[PDB]
Amino acid sequence: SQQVDKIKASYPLFLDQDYKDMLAKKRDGFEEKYPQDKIDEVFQWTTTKEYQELNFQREALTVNPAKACQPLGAVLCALGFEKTMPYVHGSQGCVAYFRSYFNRHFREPVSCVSDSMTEDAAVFGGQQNMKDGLQNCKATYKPDMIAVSTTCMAEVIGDDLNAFINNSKKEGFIPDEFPVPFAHTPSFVGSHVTGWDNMFEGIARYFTLKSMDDKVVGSNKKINIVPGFETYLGNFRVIKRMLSEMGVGYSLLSDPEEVLDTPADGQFRMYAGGTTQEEMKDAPNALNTVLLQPWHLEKTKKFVEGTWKHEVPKLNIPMGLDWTDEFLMKVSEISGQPIPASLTKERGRLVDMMTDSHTWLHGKRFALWGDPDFVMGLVKFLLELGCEPVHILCHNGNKRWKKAVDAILAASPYGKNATVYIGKDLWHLRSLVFTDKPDFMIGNSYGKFIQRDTLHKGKEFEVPLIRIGFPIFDRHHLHRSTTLGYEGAMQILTTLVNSILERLDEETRGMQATDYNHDLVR
Amino acid sequence: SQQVDKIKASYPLFLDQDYKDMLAKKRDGFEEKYPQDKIDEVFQWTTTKEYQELNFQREALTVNPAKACQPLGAVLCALGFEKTMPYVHGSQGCVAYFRSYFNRHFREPVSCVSDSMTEDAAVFGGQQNMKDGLQNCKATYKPDMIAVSTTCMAEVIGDDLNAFINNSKKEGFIPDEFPVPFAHTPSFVGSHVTGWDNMFEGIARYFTLKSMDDKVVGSNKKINIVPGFETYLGNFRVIKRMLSEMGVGYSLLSDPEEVLDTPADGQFRMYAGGTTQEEMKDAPNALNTVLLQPWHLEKTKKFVEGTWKHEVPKLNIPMGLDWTDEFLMKVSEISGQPIPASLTKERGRLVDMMTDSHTWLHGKRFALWGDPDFVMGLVKFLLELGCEPVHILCHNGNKRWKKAVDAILAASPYGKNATVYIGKDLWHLRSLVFTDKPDFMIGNSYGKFIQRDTLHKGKEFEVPLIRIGFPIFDRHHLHRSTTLGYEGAMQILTTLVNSILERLDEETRGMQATDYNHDLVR
Amino acid sequence: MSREEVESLIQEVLEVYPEKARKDRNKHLAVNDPAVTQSKKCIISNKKSQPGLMTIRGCAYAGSKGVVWGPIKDMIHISHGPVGCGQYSRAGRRNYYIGTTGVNAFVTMNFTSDFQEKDIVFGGDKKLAKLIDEVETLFPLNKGISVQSECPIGLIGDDIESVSKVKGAELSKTIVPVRCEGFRGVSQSLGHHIANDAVRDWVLGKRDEDTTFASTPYDVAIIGDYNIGGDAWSSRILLEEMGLRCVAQWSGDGSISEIELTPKVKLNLVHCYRSMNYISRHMEEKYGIPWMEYNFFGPTKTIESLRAIAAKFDESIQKKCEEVIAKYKPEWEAVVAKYRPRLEGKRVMLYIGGLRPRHVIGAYEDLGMEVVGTGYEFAHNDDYDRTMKEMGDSTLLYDDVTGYEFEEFVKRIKPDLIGSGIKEKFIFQKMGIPFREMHSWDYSGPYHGFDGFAIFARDMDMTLNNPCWKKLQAPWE
Amino acid sequence: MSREEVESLIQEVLEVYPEKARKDRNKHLAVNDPAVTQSKKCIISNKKSQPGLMTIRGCAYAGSKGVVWGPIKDMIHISHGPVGCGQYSRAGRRNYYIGTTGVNAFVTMNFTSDFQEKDIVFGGDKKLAKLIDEVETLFPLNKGISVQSECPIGLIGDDIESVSKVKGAELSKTIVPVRCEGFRGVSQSLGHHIANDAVRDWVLGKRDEDTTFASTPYDVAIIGDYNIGGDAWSSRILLEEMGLRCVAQWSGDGSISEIELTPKVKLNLVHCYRSMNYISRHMEEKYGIPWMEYNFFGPTKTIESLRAIAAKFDESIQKKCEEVIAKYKPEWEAVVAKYRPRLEGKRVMLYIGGLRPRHVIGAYEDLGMEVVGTGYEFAHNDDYDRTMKEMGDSTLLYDDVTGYEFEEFVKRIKPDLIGSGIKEKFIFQKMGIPFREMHSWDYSGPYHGFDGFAIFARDMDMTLNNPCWKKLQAPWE
Ligand code: ICS
Ligand code: CLF
Ligand code: CLF
Ligand SMILES: [Fe+3]
Ligand SMILES: [Fe+3]
């Protein structure tokens, strides 16, 4: 039953007495459900240490992973170029999933096509599919460039993208001068960041490999910036703004912030902004190339140093105080431009915020997960704040990255109790946050369920989640935040200190029980 | 008892069994406390309409007010000028309280002096105090200008600031050329915004009243901006950014963002930035003057129209979508500069954010309180989002402001169930949210206690608080936020939608009870 | 309206395509004529998509794991293959359920094999067996395992049926191998077919010899309702207020025991014909259980379906049906009285998957709203038949529309409201036309039944009449 | 060390002041000589502040309402006058208490008269009576009312004593009029005196003829402890573990009944001598109750005070005291062992109101830390007599320091850590010197007792050794 003046959605309409009775009757009559005491006992067993030992012995089963497949990153990289259509050679269900994922994270339209390979292509290949798809895409959506990636179907089959595109141009499906860069993105190798790296290396190769004769390093007096797999528009904005204050000529490669933040004024813009073809062609003439996320841009770095002959600096991600300072000083050395007074003022303001919040930030324990560079930068920033990381998880990390993170943790007294896990999923982290309870978690939306589990063990065992990373589905417009630079550091510090204060306020809101510590001033 | 490895602060150390026993023994033996059932009965009575009728019949008792006294606003206004020392002619307790209040809100040093009037000054006046204080302040802190306000002691006594300052200059305590503007700020009239208005009018009079002969309107091709009582640095930052994006020459009067956001680089800066004396002297030459908060800048408006001969536009506070558009169009008309494409893109992005969040924003009920202009702008923005304001409270509002707010509410179908209260304090608002429960409250930190009371009635009756306004003591770095303009509208929308989403996530976190609606995608 | 104008629009939109694409896409768009019963003469459906045209269709894995098998709560479903498919489909559908997640319910959890290059080169049957052992060790309260295959499994020489047989014999557990590779078929329809075949072959007949279940003359089973936003629940209560006993619901908030008990019911109430018609026909053939379609979208369709269902039973059920209708009449009458004046005269264009595009027209018509265009992603001509009678005269019908075609059709027709998926929501919101997600109910609901009608009307009013749609054009332009 | 350079520093700082200001401020700064016990010959205190020098002192209203009367939980305290005074002092002090706020506790609530121009021109006695009636109507469970006066009340000539007498006779309620106008005196010390006089005249003698309270030879009363961050609680438990009965607690977590029962105790343990010495001396004259000072900052002072207190009772109390010391020895020994190595050798400068500047030195030396400078806002000469014997040789002493003087002294001396109020916290944090709020414990605590020693040591380590202090200089600067 519903009241017209107060209509109730599923919650709390299904908490009515009649709905409760109907659910109870269903469960007691036809579900054959296990007894409640058995369920409670099994849950308690899953929260224990022996269950953790059983869980960490897994070799073949992955539960609740924390990564995706390469073509997603390839599509994200392709979306960062001007009037460029991402084109995945393979099955359609993949592109549907990619578009749904990116639509949910960004709340913005995502454009991506496929050649819709079916069972017949499982025995003859997707050459006809590639020809017809390229012709149809160029005729319908009119892109300046088509960037081709692959799914697992085409990778396992063995489809040769180079020969297929060459045959499409000869026969006459697409003009010969039309730029069609391609990259192989097997989903069973690496993760989405590897796909981003492969797509960018393919585009750079296509645009610069056969015209290096007239390129001279430092001709245009610019610096190339490769941001990698990035899902915060504020990061692109802050990088551009910092390079603008310094008066440093720069060329951002694969800039998707314009196409992922189009205004709603009555028209739908399929394309907006992005790196131009001339920028890619003139890239070898830059003074140097700076990679913002070096731990998933290894193939790009190999191509840049091998072909463009650019001495790529060994720079960490510009995350937090020390690494932002190092990045700014390296940029100043490369470009010869002094660091202005505005950036020093902003750094001083960040230091002032750190000194203001150090009392509440000191000694807190955080589990965290995400991408390698983001996780390492967040760990460094937490160490700079006096916080104690305990569970550091990266499903798509490797042994060298783990060694680097261990070296970072060993240099700080606050990394004594920290442990780094690579190849572990979110079920492993549930066991860890149960058996060794931290104060908070830092991760994407998928952590919310973990929080729920902790709340089932008790209020004193609940581990609240802080949504920093990709993807965030249960909150709105958090993709507009900034994470790199001083501004990103300020935002992260504010988020952390305010989450701590909110948790303290909640724990001390019981009147005559715990409200003696419900202080007005904190 | 304490564990060396895990040390507890007051919470939850006083929840230990021994402390609980000691507190129970104390209460049972020597406190003569009322029985718990009587306390529960009286609380339940205080949450009814019968109590609300008794509460709203109050004529002489104010409980938990939502305003401060004039010299605080005068000090804030004086802090916005270059190398200016706020000087309160009266008792030192006022200055100590002002400095503590502003330090707690801004987490930054606040400079303000007093002449320390005592009972002897209550018998013979405070002329000698004024002379000695002016000389001592100029000799010690070396300001370019001293801005003098008053406390209730000097106001009741009848101290004449003009004669006292004139005598200080002749006798030779301060040079004659030294600028010493003054303003009377009686704490029993109006509130802190009235003090800001009085201080600004006094400074403008001092700098422009006796030199209007050579002033010609529109000579310098600039627009004066008077921001009023403002405690968000982002508001100052956003107004200047939009005016520069427009290429409009402007002169911001009383700009305190520099002195309230000094960097921490190892040196203490007593003064930083601020409006210069030359800007104040050249103000009459501007094309026009724009008041950002016209409802507490009435004296300033009278002085500007009467003396400077500026036709002050009838502009509301640039809050939300419509009023920001009106302010930008008025600025474009006054200056002649067209509105650039960047501001149109920002407006379109705000509209896109609105369309994305409208499903969760629609139909929510908010009680809110604060300053008149801020409350009216927030009400307008809530009406633009489809939200329903129910309890609109402004302690320092007047009948004409209430009429204007009623006219705004009557123009929208969402303001049907809205009531405006002027002269009511936060105890009235507690009664209102108990008898007519809204979904959320929007106000300063003082609302937190109200929330606690609601939680005592039950979880289903709890009304969460959203901290927007002045002062915010229990959260860090929220004074850096933006409220005016498209950026402020985006920040407010994000805060509202995310508070709604967090409340929904909390209400549906119970496993096998309400976690069926614990959706990953929202 | 103006059939010739709509035909001119169709040709104008078709001009941009190449010759082959034009010829293929001309058959998938049509004008509606309510008199014509056979849609094969006007519209062609269930065909492969044109490459590079940004279609909205999914894959067979989405149809099988995401739609049919996923809502089953007490079973564990393994996305056998690389890691992407399970990650993108995890907790993206709002099939509601009641259980302790991670202990005895696993709907929102993502189990995957996480295939690497070695598993591709050398196969993954041993990895599958080890994974099954690990699942048994760490999740003892699971009541069955399904293995949903992805593209590499079909591509490489992997034989998961023998692994499932051996492990099910070893652990005395029900393991259902589903050959739901994404490259099979052209859309999720073949995924629905494969999942239905798996249910028939491995789960349905496990209690054929068992007679321990006490049956009652009023036994019905809900088939094809996936409890989106609690929808199935809002239906089930009505069926229990009629005096009927609902033994099973497929598959939202469903259990393996309910599927096993389904062949013991007296009637099969099928909600989604497209996905469960195969299993309904099989149950009718093998057990003699009659099945019937029902619609609970809006008060009119709800009342008609309730009376049709009660007609299949004795007089007492009909009396209770009349009592239920009389009880619920004032509520939906009040909802209509409150919300129809704000919604009368509005025009709607829809594009959903197999069933909803023709099932929701009744509620919209009850609120005084007219549907001018409709279409399907993966429906067959049988569905288009029903729709042609269901839909209005001189109205637009589209099958497997592309992004460009859909955008042009909306730009020309200019409806007041659009109902489609997440991949067109923001596109159409940028153009200034109110949009409602017709798949996940825009994270609202339920919409079935009298209780769901109030939520449907409230959502329609809140989106159609939102002030934000009046603010796209800046005052200075 | 180096007294001569400290004197040179004092003269160099004093050079900038004008003539009269120089000669007045020269008397308030001194070098410490532990041998000299008469500080009158060395330092002058309790004098009016120089105008326009940005002093840190408060007002008599802050000393009365904020400090003494405010922590009383079951009484309603009305700031009679304009609104700002009660607005700025609301919930700013962390006097902890246990109660139902708004029903039977009112500490964090702000009751005010909200005087306007009319109440200034025509007085506010009738408004005061109306306010008292409304307070009685809306807060029936309050057990007392206090009326704290502000500057306009004393300036316009309001007779609040007559109103209090009449309304107390009318409603049979205890109404205490406090003449704590801010222009009286030079600091909060006169506010403490006035509040003590009000307690003496209106509350203390209400049970002089009442003898129904059963008394014990181990009855004690804690006076001058305001339960900052729970400090008083962490003291009282220790007194409970010695076998002593604590009947009263002034004034943190205090009730009017406890104040009434105070004259029935056998000993008055005074924590803050500065604020409650008046009431202690009176209760020794009118009732014969002896009083003693005690210190619970740090394990050494805690143990010394515990033994001194137990010395006043029989042998059983001494045995219980020894048991308590033996029980709590390992805890503070572990705290010392963990935190002394990180804090040894550090130097501290302090500036707090009237008691802490000499009470915390013991804990600071217990953690191996040296105090080089100390001072007071509103202390008298006996406080400096007490301080001189506890403070280092040739160390700095300052009374009512100004902002410029304090900044110059810290800039020259360069200590490792500073303890002061909120108005210097950010000033000294911007100069890169670790700062601890010595008034509110930086929203931490408690610091009294063995339990508070662990928190104090942990806070000192977390602030003094925070990495943020190493990042103030940019690497390119
Ligand atoms: S009462 Fe005094 S300023 Fe003795 S007004 Fe002040 S809670 Fe200080 S040094 Mo804040 S004479 Fe108490 C004090 Fe000491 S408020 Fe507290 S810390 S021991
Ligand atoms: S058509 Fe369908 S959704 Fe596509 S893969 Fe095939 S079953 Fe799956 Fe998952 S892993 Fe990534 S997204 Fe694909 S490319 Fe290899
Ligand atoms: S010395 Fe003391 S604190 Fe000062 S006023 Fe006087 S009693 Fe009070 Fe409150 S109201 Fe405002 S701050 Fe003053 S100026 Fe009039
Ligand atoms: Fe958007
Ligand atoms: Fe600060």
Side-chain angles (χ1 to χ4, degrees), chain A residues 1-2 4 7-10 13-14 18-19 22-23 26 30-34 39 42-43 45 51 54-55 58-65 67-69 72 85 91-93 96-99 101 103-104 107-109 111-115 118-119 129 132-133 136-137 139-142 152-153 156-157 187-188 262-268 270 427 446 449 452, chain C residues 16-18 20-21 49-55 57-59 62 73 83 87-90 92 96 100-101 103-104 109-117 120 127 130-131 134-135 137-139 141 143 152 155-156 183-186 207 229-230 233-234 236-237 245-247 249 253 257-258 331 338-339 404 407 423 426-427 430-431 445-446 451 454-455 458 472:
Chain A
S1 270
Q2 292 261 43
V4 47
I7 304 164
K8 278 157 15 150
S10 78
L13 167 81
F14 293 129
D18 53 357
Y19 281 105
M22 166 220 80
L23 290 166
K26 161 171 213 290
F30 316 109
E31 282 189 21
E32 284 179 23
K33 192 174 173 165
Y34 276 109
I39 283 152
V42 170
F43 177 79
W45 167 69
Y51 187 87
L54 290 183
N55 188 12
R58 270 193 279 131
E59 307 180 7
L61 167 76
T62 293
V63 179
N64 294 348
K67 47 161 185 201
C69 60
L72 188 87
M85 170 81 39
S91 333
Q92 27 162 58
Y97 272 144
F98 305 152
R99 287 178 76 204
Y101 221 56
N103 278 137
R104 278 155 185 174
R107 281 148 213 288
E108 285 281 310
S111 290
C112 183
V113 284
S114 83
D115 39 23
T118 58
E119 234 188 346
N129 293 76
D132 282 332
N136 282 351
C137 195
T140 307
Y141 303 105
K142 317 232 174 34
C152 51
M153 195 220 175
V156 171
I157 270 169
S187 49
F188 37 87
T262 47
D265 58 352
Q267 339 165 21
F268 163 57
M270 193 155 245
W427 203 245
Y446 295 120
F449 306 114
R452 184 206 41 200
Chain C
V16 80
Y17 289 134
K20 178 157 145 202
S49 286
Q50 293 280 291
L53 279 199
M54 209 184 296
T55 168
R57 286 168 156 188
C59 69
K73 50 188 186 177
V83 81
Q87 183 81 333
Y88 306 135
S89 63
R90 178 194 177 189
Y96 278 13
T100 307
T101 313
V103 183
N104 79 294
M109 296 198 33
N110 178 15
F111 301 85
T112 178
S113 265
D114 202 11
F115 259 38
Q116 248 76 59
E117 209 215 74
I120 291 287
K127 180 178 235 215
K130 184 104 215 303
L131 173 145
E134 263 145 31
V135 165
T137 286
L138 293 150
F139 302 93
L141 294 201
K143 281 170 96 168
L155 285 195
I156 72 170
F183 63 83
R184 297 181 195 285
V186 306
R207 293 187 199 210
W233 290 336
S234 308
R236 182 198 188 94
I237 189 139
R245 186 168 75 141
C246 191
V247 170
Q249 32 186 77
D253 197 31
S257 77
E258 286 171 83
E331 321 219 288
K338 176 186 199 120
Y339 285 113
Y404 158 89
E407 189 194 342
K423 304 199 284 291
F426 311 109
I427 296 173
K430 300 224 175 247
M431 317 183 15
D451 282 354
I455 305 160
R458 174 255 261 162
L472 274 64

Side-chain angles (χ1 to χ4, degrees), chain B residues 19-20 36 68 78-79 129 159 169 190 253 312 334 356 385 432:
Chain B
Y19 281 106
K20 216 165 305 175
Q36 192 46 49
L79 261 156
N129 295 71
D159 274 2
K169 268 153 187 248
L253 315 183
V312 171
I334 291 170
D356 284 346
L385 297 173
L432 285 176

Side-chain angles (χ1 to χ4, degrees), chain B residues 1-2 4 7-10 13-14 18-19 22-23 26 30-34 38-39 42-43 45 51 54-55 58-69 72 85 91-93 96-101 103-104 107-109 111-115 118-119 122 129 132-133 136-137 139-142 152-153 156 187-188 262-268 270 395 427 446 449 452, chain D residues 16-18 20-21 49-55 57-59 62 73 82-83 87-90 92 96 100-101 103-104 109-117 120 127 130-131 134-135 137-141 143 152 155-156 183-186 207 229-230 233-234 236-237 245-247 249 253 255 257-258 331 338-339 403-404 407 423 426-427 430-431 445-446 451 454-455 458 472:
Chain B
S1 269
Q2 289 269 38
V4 47
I7 298 162
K8 304 146 122 150
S10 72
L13 164 86
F14 292 129
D18 54 355
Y19 281 106
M22 170 213 74
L23 289 166
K26 168 188 194 290
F30 319 109
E31 284 186 12
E32 285 177 32
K33 193 178 177 161
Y34 279 111
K38 164 68 96 150
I39 283 155
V42 171
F43 176 78
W45 166 67
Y51 183 86
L54 289 182
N55 191 9
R58 267 194 279 133
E59 301 182 11
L61 164 78
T62 294
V63 180
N64 302 343
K67 54 168 176 170
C69 62
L72 184 89
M85 183 46 77
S91 34
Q92 65 202 6
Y97 272 140
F98 307 152
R99 287 178 77 204
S100 297
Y101 220 59
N103 280 142
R104 275 163 187 154
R107 281 152 216 287
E108 289 280 307
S111 271
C112 182
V113 293
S114 155
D115 37 5
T118 57
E119 198 143 19
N129 295 71
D132 284 330
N136 277 345
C137 173
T140 305
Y141 301 109
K142 311 229 183 37
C152 44
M153 195 221 175
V156 172
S187 49
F188 36 89
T262 42
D265 56 354
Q267 141 188 17
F268 164 58
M270 175 166 271
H395 204 174
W427 202 246
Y446 294 121
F449 303 118
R452 178 205 50 204
Chain D
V16 77
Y17 287 134
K20 167 161 142 203
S49 313
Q50 291 280 295
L53 281 199
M54 213 191 287
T55 176
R57 287 168 152 190
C59 72
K73 55 180 166 180
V83 72
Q87 183 78 318
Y88 308 135
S89 62
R90 176 191 180 192
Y96 277 14
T100 308
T101 311
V103 184
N104 78 294
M109 299 195 33
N110 178 13
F111 302 91
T112 179
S113 266
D114 198 22
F115 257 32
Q116 241 68 56
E117 224 234 40
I120 302 286
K127 181 188 213 184
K130 189 72 216 332
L131 175 144
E134 294 171 1
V135 165
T137 289
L138 292 150
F139 301 93
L141 295 202
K143 292 173 84 170
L155 290 184
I156 70 189
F183 65 84
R184 302 191 198 279
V186 305
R207 291 189 207 220
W233 290 336
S234 309
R236 160 198 207 100
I237 186 134
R245 196 165 72 137
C246 296
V247 188
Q249 186 169 307
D253 197 33
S255 62
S257 68
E258 281 158 275
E331 330 217 344
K338 178 184 189 124
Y339 286 114
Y404 158 89
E407 194 192 346
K423 303 198 284 292
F426 312 108
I427 291 169
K430 277 172 189 293
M431 318 180 15
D451 281 353
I455 305 160
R458 170 255 255 170
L472 269 90

Side-chain angles (χ1 to χ4, degrees), chain D residues 63 67 93 188 192 224 226 228 271-272 274-275 352-357 377-378 438-440:
Chain D
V67 168
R93 235 184 92 181
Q188 300 101 305
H192 302 156
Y226 302 94
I228 299 296
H271 178 247
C272 179
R274 175 79 267 123
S275 67
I352 317 108
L355 175 81
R356 275 146 205 211
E377 296 174 36
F378 45 81
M438 275 339 272
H439 302 243
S440 68

Side-chain angles (χ1 to χ4, degrees), chain B residues 448-462:
Chain B
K448 74 182 288 162
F449 303 118
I450 295 175
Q451 184 172 353
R452 178 205 50 204
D453 300 345
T454 46
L455 176 56
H456 195 235
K457 197 185 177 193
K459 179 53 88 158
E460 59 271 37
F461 305 114
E462 179 177 30

Side-chain angles (χ1 to χ4, degrees), chain A residues 304-491:
Chain A
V304 168
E305 301 206 47
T307 302
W308 298 356
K309 318 307 236 204
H310 284 180
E311 313 274 8
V312 174
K314 225 199 73 173
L315 275 177
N316 294 289
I317 182 156
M319 278 228 180
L321 202 42
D322 281 338
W323 286 359
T324 312
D325 296 347
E326 282 168 18
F327 164 83
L328 280 186
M329 296 182 83
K330 175 57 72 169
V331 164
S332 175
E333 144 178 350
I334 291 159
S335 61
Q337 305 261 336
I339 297 160
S342 68
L343 293 179
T344 308
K345 203 159 118 168
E346 183 172 11
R347 179 195 191 278
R349 283 166 168 156
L350 170 65
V351 175
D352 186 84
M353 291 182 37
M354 293 171 105
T355 55
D356 283 358
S357 299
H358 88 268
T359 43
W360 294 111
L361 288 171
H362 189 265
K364 287 310 185 311
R365 290 148 55 83
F366 297 94
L368 57 138
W369 67 99
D371 280 335
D373 295 276
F374 156 81
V375 156
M376 191 190 17
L378 172 63
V379 164
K380 184 64 160 61
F381 189 43
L382 281 165
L383 288 178
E384 291 166 351
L385 293 165
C387 305
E388 285 214 321
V390 282
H391 312 301
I392 293 157
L393 193 128
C394 186
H395 200 189
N396 39 2
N398 57 288
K399 262 191 47 93
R400 314 196 304 293
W401 170 92
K402 172 178 170 47
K403 183 179 314 307
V405 171
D406 276 344
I408 283 140
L409 289 159
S412 166
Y414 307 103
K416 288 311 154 253
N417 294 289
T419 313
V420 188
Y421 308 87
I422 56 167
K424 305 303 181 199
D425 48 54
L426 292 202
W427 203 245
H428 288 118
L429 192 100
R430 188 205 163 253
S431 286
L432 289 170
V433 305
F434 264 128
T435 54
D436 192 23
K437 182 190 171 302
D439 293 308
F440 287 89
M441 310 172 313
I442 307 170
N444 50 25
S445 272
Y446 295 120
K448 65 181 299 160
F449 306 114
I450 297 177
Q451 178 166 4
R452 184 206 41 200
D453 289 347
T454 48
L455 178 57
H456 195 53
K457 197 185 181 196
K459 175 57 87 176
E460 58 271 26
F461 305 116
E462 184 180 23
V463 182
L465 167 71
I466 299 161
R467 287 156 175 82
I468 311 181
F470 168 82
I472 297 182
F473 292 152
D474 46 3
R475 300 293 191 267
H476 286 211
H477 332 292
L478 292 193
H479 65 278
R480 317 177 61 80
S481 320
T482 310
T483 284
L484 323 177
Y486 301 132
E487 155 174 48
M490 296 185 198
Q491 289 189 19

